[PDB]
C-alpha cells in the first residue's frame, strides 16, 4: 500500500506515535517519507547482508527474522514479512521498541539527515487529525 501523507499521519496517531518518547507526529511522517516514500512494500539490501523492510525500513540484523541474515537477532519477535503489510500495526509496535532503546530516532539515518532540526510540523499541516 502506498499511503497518502495525511492518511498515514492519522493511522500513526491512532496507533499512539504522536509524542511517543517525545517525538511529535511530524517526525514519524517525515521519517516514513524519506525511508520508504510511504510504501509499505519497500525493501532494500545492506552491504552486510541484512535487509530493511517496510514503511520505516526496519533492519533484519537486529529486529526481525528473514531467514537469511546469519547470526542476527529478532528483537521484535516477528517475521520481517509482517512489516510489509498494508496494516502498519507490526511496524509501529516494532518502531516503539527501537526508539526506546537509547538512541531515539537517530536509529533512522534518513530522519537524522533529512528531518532532524527541520520544521517537521510541516508534514502534518493541512491534515484533519
Ligand atoms: Cl509535528
Ligand atoms: Cl530521545
Ligand atoms: Na534477524
Amino acid at each position: 500500500k502506498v499511503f497518502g501523507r495525511c492518511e498515514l499521519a492519522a493511522a500513526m496517531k491512532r496507533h499512539g506515535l504522536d509524542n511517543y518518547r517525545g517525538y511529535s507526529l511530524g517526525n514519524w511522517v517525515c521519517a516514513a517519507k524519506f525511508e520508504s516514500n510511504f510504501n509499505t512494500q519497500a525493501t532494500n539490501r545492506n552491504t552486510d547482508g541484512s535487509t530493511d523492510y517496510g514503511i520505516l525500513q526496519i533492519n533484519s540484523r537486529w529486529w526481525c527474522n528473514d531467514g537469511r541474515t546469519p547470526g542476527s537477532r529478532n528483537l521484535c519477535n516477528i517475521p520481517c514479512s509482517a512489516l510489509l503489510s498494508s496494516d502498519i500495526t507490526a511496524s509501529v509496535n516494532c518502531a516503539k521498541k527501537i526508539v526506546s532503546d537509547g538512541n531515539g530516532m537517530n536509529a533512522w539515518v534518513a530522519w537524522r539527515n533529512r528531518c532532524k532540526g527541520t520544521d517537521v510540523q510541516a508534514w502534518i499541516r493541512g491534515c484533519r487529525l
Side-chain angles (χ1 to χ4, degrees):
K1 168 168 186 186
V2 179
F3 278 80
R5 174 177 69 86
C6 295
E7 183 186 20
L8 180 66
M12 287 185 155
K13 181 173 152 131
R14 178 171 68 97
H15 281 96
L17 278 186
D18 189 17
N19 300 133
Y20 191 86
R21 298 281 290 211
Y23 290 92
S24 63
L25 188 61
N27 283 285
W28 297 101
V29 174
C30 185
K33 173 63 170 180
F34 294 124
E35 290 289 351
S36 69
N37 210 7
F38 297 148
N39 180 7
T40 67
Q41 291 197 80
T43 60
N44 285 296
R45 189 101 200 239
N46 310 124
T47 58
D48 64 6
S50 65
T51 300
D52 297 331
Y53 295 88
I55 193 165
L56 287 168
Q57 289 291 275
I58 290 171
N59 183 260
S60 65
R61 193 153 290 281
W62 301 103
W63 306 105
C64 62
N65 179 49
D66 67 2
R68 70 172 198 186
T69 313
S72 63
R73 298 264 272 271
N74 183 10
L75 290 169
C76 290
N77 291 133
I78 48 161
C80 298
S81 65
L83 300 178
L84 301 182
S85 178
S86 48
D87 168 8
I88 62 174
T89 295
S91 282
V92 171
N93 288 343
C94 187
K96 288 182 175 161
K97 295 167 136 283
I98 301 174
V99 72
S100 295
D101 77 3
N103 308 293
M105 286 202 74
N106 294 296
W108 286 279
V109 64
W111 179 84
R112 193 169 74 241
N113 290 327
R114 306 181 74 177
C115 302
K116 189 176 184 180
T118 76
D119 172 20
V120 295
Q121 187 273 330
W123 287 102
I124 56 172
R125 175 169 299 150
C127 302
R128 206 184 274 119
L129 302 174

